[PDB]
Amino acid sequence: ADPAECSIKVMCRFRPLNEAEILRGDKFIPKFKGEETVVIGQGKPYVFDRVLPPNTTQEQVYNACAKQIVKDVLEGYNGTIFAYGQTSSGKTHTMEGKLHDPQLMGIIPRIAHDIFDHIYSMDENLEFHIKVSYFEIYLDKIRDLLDVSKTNLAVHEDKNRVPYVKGCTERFVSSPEEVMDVIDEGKANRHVAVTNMNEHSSRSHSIFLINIKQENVETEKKLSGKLYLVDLAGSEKV
Amino acid sequence: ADPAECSIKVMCRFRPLNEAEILRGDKFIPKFKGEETVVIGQGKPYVFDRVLPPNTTQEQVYNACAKQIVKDVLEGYNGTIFAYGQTSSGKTHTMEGKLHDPQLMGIIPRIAHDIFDHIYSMDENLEFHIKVSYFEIYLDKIRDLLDVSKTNLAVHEDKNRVPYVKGCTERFVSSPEEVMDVIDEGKANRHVAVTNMNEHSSRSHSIFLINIKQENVETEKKLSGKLYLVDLAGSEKV
Amino acid sequence: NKSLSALGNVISALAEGTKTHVPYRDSKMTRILQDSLGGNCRTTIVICCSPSVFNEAETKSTLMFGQRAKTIKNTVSVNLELTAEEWKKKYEKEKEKNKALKSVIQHLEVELNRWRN
Amino acid sequence: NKSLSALGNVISALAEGTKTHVPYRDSKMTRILQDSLGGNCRTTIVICCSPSVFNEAETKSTLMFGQRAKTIKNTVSVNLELTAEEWKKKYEKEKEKNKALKSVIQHLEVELNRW
Numbered sequence: 210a211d212p213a214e215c216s217i218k219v220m221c222r223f224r225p226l227n228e229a230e231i232l233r234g235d236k237f238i239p240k241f242k243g244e245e246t247v248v249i250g251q252g253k254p255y256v257f258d259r260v261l262p263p264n265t266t267q268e269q270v271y272n273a274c275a276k277q278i279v280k281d282v283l284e285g286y287n288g289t290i291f292a293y294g295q296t297s298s299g300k301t302h303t304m305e306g307k308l309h310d311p312q313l314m315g316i317i318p319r320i321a322h323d324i325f326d327h328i329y330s331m332d333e334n335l336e337f338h339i340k341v342s343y344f345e346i347y348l349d350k351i352r353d354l355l356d357v358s359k360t361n362l363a364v365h366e367d368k369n370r371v372p373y374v375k376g377c378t379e380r381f382v383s384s385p386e387e388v389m390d391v392i393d394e395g396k397a398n399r400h401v402a403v404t405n406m407n408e409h410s411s412r413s414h415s416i417f418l419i420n421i422k423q424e425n426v427e428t429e430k431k432l433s434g435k436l437y438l439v440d441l442a443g444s445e446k447v
Numbered sequence: 448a449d450p451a452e453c454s455i456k457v458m459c460r461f462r463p464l465n466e467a468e469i470l471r472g473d474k475f476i477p478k479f480k481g482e483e484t485v486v487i488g489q490g491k492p493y494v495f496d497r498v499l500p501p502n503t504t505q506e507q508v509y510n511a512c513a514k515q516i517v518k519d520v521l522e523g524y525n526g527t528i529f530a531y532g533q534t535s536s537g538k539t540h541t542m543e544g545k546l547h548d549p550q551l552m553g554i555i556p557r558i559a560h561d562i563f564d565h566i567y568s569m570d571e572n573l574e575f576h577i578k579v580s581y582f583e584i585y586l587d588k589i590r591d592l593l594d595v596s597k598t599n600l601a602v603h604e605d606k607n608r609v610p611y612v613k614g615c616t617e618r619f620v621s622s623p624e625e626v627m628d629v630i631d632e633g634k635a636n637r638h639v640a641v642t643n644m645n646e647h648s649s650r651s652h653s654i655f656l657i658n659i660k661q662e663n664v665e666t667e668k669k670l671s672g673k674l675y676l677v678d679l680a681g682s683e684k685v
Numbered sequence: 686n687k688s689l690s691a692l693g694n695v696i697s698a699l700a701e702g703t704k705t706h707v708p709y710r711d712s713k714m715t716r717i718l719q720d721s722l723g724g725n726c727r728t729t730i731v732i733c734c735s736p737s738v739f740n741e742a743e744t745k746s747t748l749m750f751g752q753r754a755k756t757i758k759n760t761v762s763v764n765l766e767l768t769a770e771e772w773k774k775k776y777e778k779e780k781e782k783n784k785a786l787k788s789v790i791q792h793l794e795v796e797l798n799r800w801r802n
Numbered sequence: 803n804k805s806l807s808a809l810g811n812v813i814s815a816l817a818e819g820t821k822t823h824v825p826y827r828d829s830k831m832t833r834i835l836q837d838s839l840g841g842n843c844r845t846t847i848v849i850c851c852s853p854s855v856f857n858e859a860e861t862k863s864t865l866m867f868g869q870r871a872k873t874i875k876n877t878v879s880v881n882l883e884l885t886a887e888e889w890k891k892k893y894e895k896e897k898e899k900n901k902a903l904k905s906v907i908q909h910l911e912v913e914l915n916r917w
């Protein structure tokens with residue numbers, strides 16, 4: 210066929226001043242203009258795909274940042290959503306949120322429900338096989354969160370030269386709930402060997418991987434998508 | 448896109464004057480220059496890839512002639528070695544030689560050793576499957592040597608037009624020990640119906656065929672090479 | 686942080702158009718995300734920031750990663766699952782058209798030249 | 803000596819560079835040693851020989867047989883079965899060609915309706 214160019218989208222999510230900050234009487238520097246511009250005091254304006262101010266809820270940030278990737282993924286396209294920021298800025302509230310709270314869950318949890326909400330509605334002639342993965346990377350080392358005994362996982366290259374974590378654990382899910390369970394499990398296991406999680410996360414990337422494969426039993430056409438939901442490490446400098 | 452040119456290499460191996468010749472007081476005519484030239488008495492030099500004098504041992508001939516083929520064929524290339532020359536010239540000594548004597552064995556014996564010798568040190572991703580067959584060609588008829596039951600085997604052709612003996616015996620081998628059993632087995636059989644053995648082979652053609660097919664599980668890539676170890680029959684005139 | 690280091694070198698080196706020796710292999714992640722960062726995939730980047738003046742320097746930096754990131758362009762294409770058979774067959778098909786077009790091309794040419802000649 | 807004959811025949815022809823009715827079918831052997839004598843195969847030929855002057859004749863011939871076969875040039879090609887995702891590449895670039903072809907049409911077919 211003919212594949213299309215597509216700029217990588219970027220969302221600017223700004224978080225509320227928090228208790229310490231409030232108390233110290235800090236003032237909110239960002240000035241929002243429209244849905245995708247942000248001004249910092251008196252400097253050149255910043256323009257992004259969308260600029261998510263502090264009052265933008267978790268639903269909204271899902272609907273503006275991830276609702277369309279689930280759709281593309283279920284169709285054969287590879288979607289990748291990631292959080293980049295400074296420690297304490299907002300990445301984890303974004304990506305995971307209050308994992309089992311309807312109001313405050315984040316991207317992952319939501320993509321967990323969307324994928325199966327979409328699927329269940331499809332025609333029975335469409336046969337999906339969703340298999341999840343959950344590893345973390347610390348000081349350039351990959352640790353399967355679902356098998357804590359695996360701690361120096363390698364990245365090889367598949368059939369068609371595409372990088373990938375070899376030997377990680379792959380779970381076949383069949384509901385929003387079995388994916389949550391995989392989240393829950395890797396959330397605990399992350400502790401195994403960790404004295405300070407706060408410090409840990411602050412320096413570790415948590416990488417969730419929904420690997421979708423669909424098959425039309427009628428027409429026999431088969432497609433596969435790789436959904437990478439990454440929660441990177443603090444970007445704070447030297 | 449492309450295949451690479453490169454010509455047939457010819458090695459000339461001279462054998463040391465025999466006891467019988469000895470007594471008569473035969474004169475030694477060959478006159479060698481460097482490692483590729485030779486001239487008889489007062490003629491023009493015949494240059495070959497290499498030229499092994501009478502003191503050439505079976506380890507040197509192999510190193511000079513069949514060391515590479517094994518690598519080649521193990522790379523996916525086709526390999527073919529054959530001995531040519533008048534009867535009692537050295538062909539069978541060179542091709543087979545003292546079959547189990549670790550010093551006086553010839554190309555064949557060594558090749559079977561190297562093949563597995565190599566496979567062991569070879570990539571852990573690719574599985575092998577070596578398939579040997581052993582037949583003779585006397586009076587244009589192809590005799591299966593691992594089955595004296597078959598005696599008029601026929602040449603057919605494969606999808607991309609390459610000839611090959613049809614309905615011949617095919618033996619799977621995963622060790623040098625096994626390969627030599629087939630040689631051993633076929634060396635015997637050839638006796639079936641043979642009155643005096645000297646004459647017959649002196650006038651027959653034995654072709655050993657090793658078919659190496661490997662496939663990297665990791666990258667799937669499947670490879671294949673064909674080795675044809677042939678000892679021609681006496682080339683003498685009249 | 687050598688992965689972010691890795692990351693940042695990847696982005697910038699991509700943001701350029703250099704897309705030649707873009708340091709993918711600089712880290713375990715730059716490779717996992719190799720597809721995500723400059724290839725077959727639809728990437729969204731939620732850059733997170735703090736509104737306080739004390740975090741202003743970092744806020745600035747984060748913004749600029751977004752800025753430069755916004756100018757990377759991926760070549761997205763649905764992922765098709767086929768045996769080698771299918772791929773060889775469809776390739777054969779896309780070779781029948783090749784031959785086909787040829788004639789039509791050599792058709793026009795003749796006329797125009799011929800027509801003209 | 804059929805076999806040796808065909809082999810004789812096939813060598814000298816290839817020697818010359820005639821390949822076209824090079825008589826592979828002259829025998830069952832030459833058919834098998836078909837791909838070996840002028841096709842896809844790295845091939846070595848050890849011409850064993852007697853040092854005695856009493857056999858000067860064959861040797862000399864044998865040298866010449868040896869001399870002939872080195873001039874033959876085969877075409878080496880690793881026999882590596884195409885990957886699914888390998889063929890897929892084939893199609894891919896043979897689709898640009900076909901795209902680049904419709905564009906060699908497009909312009910080429912614009913003048914055609916100009917006149």
Ligand SMILES: Nc1ncnc2c1ncn2[C@H]1O[C@@H](COP(=O)(O)OP(=O)(O)O)[C@H](O)[C@@H]1O
Nearest residue numbers: 224225294295296297298299300301302303733
């Ligand atoms: N009450 C709230 N409502 C909305 N967002 C909030 C609230 N309290 C905190 N946040 C935000 O504060 C941040 C807390 O998580 P954070 O410290 O930023 O995670 P990380 O350590 O991954 O950067 C989240 O990123 C989020 O945007």
Ligand SMILES: Nc1ncnc2c1ncn2[C@H]1O[C@@H](COP(=O)(O)OP(=O)(O)O)[C@H](O)[C@@H]1O
Nearest residue numbers: 462463501533534535536537538539540541649
């Ligand atoms: N360098 C050598 N030293 C000792 N014997 C040799 C040597 N080269 C060849 N021969 C051996 O091989 C034999 C030569 O005849 P042969 O192997 O039967 O060849 P073919 O029948 O193929 O001509 C002699 O009988 C002998 O044992």
